[PDB]
Amino acid sequence: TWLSDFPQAWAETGGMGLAVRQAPLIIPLKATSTPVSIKQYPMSQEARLGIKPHIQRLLDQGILVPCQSPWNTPLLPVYRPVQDLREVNKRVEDIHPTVPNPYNLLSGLPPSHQWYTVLDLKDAFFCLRLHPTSQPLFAFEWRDPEMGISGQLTWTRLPQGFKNSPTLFDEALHRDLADFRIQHPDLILLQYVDDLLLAATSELDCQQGTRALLQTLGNLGYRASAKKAQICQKQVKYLGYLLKEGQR
Partner DNA sequence: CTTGGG
Partner DNA sequence: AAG
- CA 88 – CA 90 distance, rounded (Å): 5
**Closer residue to DNA (CB): 165 or 191:** 165
CB of 104 to DNA, least distance (A): 20
**Closer residue to DNA (CB): 25 or 76:** 76
Question: Which of left, alpha, beta for 123 (phi over 0: left; psi -120 to 50: alpha)?
Answer: left
- CA 123 – CA 225 distance, rounded (Å): 10
Q: Between helices 203-220 and 165-183, what is the axis angle to 10°?
A: 130
CB of 166 to DNA, least distance (A): 9
- CA 95 – CA 184 distance, rounded (Å): 31
- CA 244 – CA 248 distance, rounded (Å): 7
CB of 80 to DNA, least distance (A): 12
**What is the three-class DSSP state of 197?**
strand
**Closer residue to DNA (CB): 128 or 200:** 128
CB of 37 to DNA, least distance (A): 14
CB of 184 to DNA, least distance (A): 34
Interface contacts to DNA, rule CB under 7 A: 41, 74, 76-78, 82-86, 89, 161-162
- CA 199 – CA 115 distance, rounded (Å): 6
CB of 78 to DNA, least distance (A): 5
**Closer residue to DNA (CB): 42 or 145:** 42
Please report, for residues 27, 34, 47, 207, the alpha-carbon distance to residue 31 in angstroms, rounded to integers and kept in the order given: 12, 9, 37, 50
**Closer residue to DNA (CB): 81 or 218:** 81
DSSP string computed for 61-77: TTSEEEE--S-B-PBP-
What single-letter amino acid sits at 181? R
**Closer residue to DNA (CB): 90 or 234:** 90
CB of 157 to DNA, least distance (A): 16
- Residue 47 sits at φ, ψ, to 5 deg, of -65, -45
**Closer residue to DNA (CB): 43 or 187:** 43
